[PDB]
Amino acid sequence: AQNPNCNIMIFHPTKEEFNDFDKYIAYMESQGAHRAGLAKIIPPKEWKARETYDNISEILIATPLQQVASGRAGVFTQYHKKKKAMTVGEYRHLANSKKYQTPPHQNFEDLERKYWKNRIYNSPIYGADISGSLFDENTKQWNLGHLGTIQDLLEKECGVVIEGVNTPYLYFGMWKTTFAWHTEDMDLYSINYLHLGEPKTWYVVPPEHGQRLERLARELFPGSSRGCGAFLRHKVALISPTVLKENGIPFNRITQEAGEFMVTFPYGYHAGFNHGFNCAEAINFATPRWIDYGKMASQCSCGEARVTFSMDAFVRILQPERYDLWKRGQD
Ligand SMILES: O=C(O)CNC(=O)C(=O)O
Ligand SMILES: [Mg+2]
Numbered sequence: 001a002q003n004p005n006c007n008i009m010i011f012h013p014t015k016e017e018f019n020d021f022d023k024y025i026a027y028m029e030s031q032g033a034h035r036a037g038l039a040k041i042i043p044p045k046e047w048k049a050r051e052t053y054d055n056i057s058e059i060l061i062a063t064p065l066q067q068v069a070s071g072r073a074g075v076f077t078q079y080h081k082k083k084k085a086m087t088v089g090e091y092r093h094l095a096n097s098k099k100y101q102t103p104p105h106q107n108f109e110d111l112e113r114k115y116w117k118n119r120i121y122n123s124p125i126y127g128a129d130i131s132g133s134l135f136d137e138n139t140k141q142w143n144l145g146h147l148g149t150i151q152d153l154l155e156k157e158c159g160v161v162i163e164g165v166n167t168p169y170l171y172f173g174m175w176k177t178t179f180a181w182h183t184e185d186m187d188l189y190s191i192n193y194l195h196l197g198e199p200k201t202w203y204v205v206p207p208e209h210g211q212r213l214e215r216l217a218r219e220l221f222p223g224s225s226r227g228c229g230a231f232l233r234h235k236v237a238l239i240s241p242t243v244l245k246e247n248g249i250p251f252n253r254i255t256q257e258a259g260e261f262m263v264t265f266p267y268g269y270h271a272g273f274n275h276g277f278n279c280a281e282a283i284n285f286a287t288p289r290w291i292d293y294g295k296m297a298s299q300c301s302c303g304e305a306r307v308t309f310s311m312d313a314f315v316r317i318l319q320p321e322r323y324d325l326w327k328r329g330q331d
């Protein structure tokens with residue numbers, strides 16, 4: 001069995017190997033990459049996402065989200081308070097202000113310490129989930145707006161033809177902006193490219209151990225667990241590495257830098273934080289190996305998780321027994 005310790009693997013494809021996206025994902029899996037839940041892919045030196053970022057400040061963040069924490073430093077939830085619209089140029093200036101900027105630090109490890117010590121005492125503003133792309137249309141390799149769609153994968157593997165679309169999303173971050181512990185919708189893959197700016201630190205639980213994280217989360221967030229049998233779908237709960245280690249939960253960590261891709265694999269729980277002003281692009285995708293994870297994915301039916309249009313068909317076809325309850329939670 002390849003990668004039996006479930007370590008995060010780092011790949012350096014050549015320009016030739018960067019041509020065929022599906023083939024390279026399958027290659028990484030042949031080497032056991034999926035066992036970690038997360039892999040890093042460093043593009044060949046010849047590749048670029050676009051020529052420059054000199055022209056992005058006019059993008060609008062229609063609904064910036066202030067991430068307000070409750071709990072203790074290592075075990076907390078966050079709620080998203082909506083803020084007035086602002087441009088990327090306005091948000092960059094805000095990120096760089098004395099109130100929000102990254103503090104002085106020695107290295108990534110020192111910054112990670114400071115994040116976990118102090119996160120809860122601040123409320124950073126995240127421009128998340130913005131439909132759009134920063135890949136140049138002429139970038140042919142690993143262009144996250146030109147991937148094969150999940151609907152087409154389901155049609156190819158299963159024969160069924162469904163509605164829905166699959167487009168990328170932009171994320172503008174600042175110091176301490178946080179992504180809570182989650183798997184993807186329908187336990188899909190994700191791919192994330194850090195276009196520019198400061199790093200993103202990731203934590204991940206191997207898919208084979210995801211239920212260990214779920215059981216800890218039920219212990220640590222007991223009212224949320226009574227409310228919903230899949231409350232991590234709400235994407236609000238944070239648990240620190242120290243708390244994970246105290247409770248014996250297997251996990252790994254890695255820091256993504258600008259110019260790097262990360263892939264999350266089906267049912268790989270992940271969480272993390274931004275080091276300073278940055279911009280990432282991410283999208284969900286599927287492969288044949290996903291289908292069995294999609295069939296078994298948990299679902300939130302309590303009403304909180306509310307998701308895209310395109311998830312309807314996935315539930316309807318892969319999980320027809322659950323469909324009626326889940327759709328009630330959507331409506
Ligand atoms: O970058 C972020 O805030 C969150 N991204 C993801 O969870 C992802 O790419 O799957
Ligand atoms: Mg612009």
Ligand code: NI
Nearest residue numbers: 183184190264
């Ligand atoms: Ni994710």
Ligand SMILES: [Zn+2]
Nearest residue numbers: 228300302304
């Ligand atoms: Zn729920």
